[PDB]
Amino acid sequence: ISPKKSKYMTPMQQKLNEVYEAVKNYTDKRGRRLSAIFLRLPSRSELPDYYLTIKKPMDMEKIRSHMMANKYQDIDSMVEDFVMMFNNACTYNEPESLIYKDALVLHKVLLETRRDL
């Protein structure tokens, strides 16, 4: 159960949402939306080994709900959560894996987007 969304979006929320959407909406040459696998982690019952391999689980739905509850006090705090999520993907998965490679690309999209705001 996620925190209740706020009525209007603060300016900070709008700025954060611009970053969130840039990462969510990014597509490769073949139009594949790289974010799909990062939207929601499987549960502990579904992927138990994962949760003992990384220190702090993160997915985009967690970030989104925190963002929509007006809980992020600045851009860097959300960027940190995206970095942790991509770092976690590169920890658990092999460098030869698609998920790992997509994590490197979206990490770049993330930092470029912040840079350009």
Side-chain angles (χ1 to χ4, degrees), residues 56-70:
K56 189 170 167 54
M58 187 56 60
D59 56 34
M60 290 180 66
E61 292 302 324
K62 192 179 285 168
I63 290 175
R64 189 166 192 285
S65 53
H66 195 80
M67 172 186 71
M68 297 306 189
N70 198 26

Side-chain angles (χ1 to χ4, degrees), residues 1-3 21 25 28 39 46 53 62 67 88 95 97 108:
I1 166 168
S2 31
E21 286 293 295
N25 294 331
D28 68 12
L39 293 190
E46 287 174 313
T53 300
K62 192 179 285 168
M67 172 186 71
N88 288 347
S97 74
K108 195 169 196 276

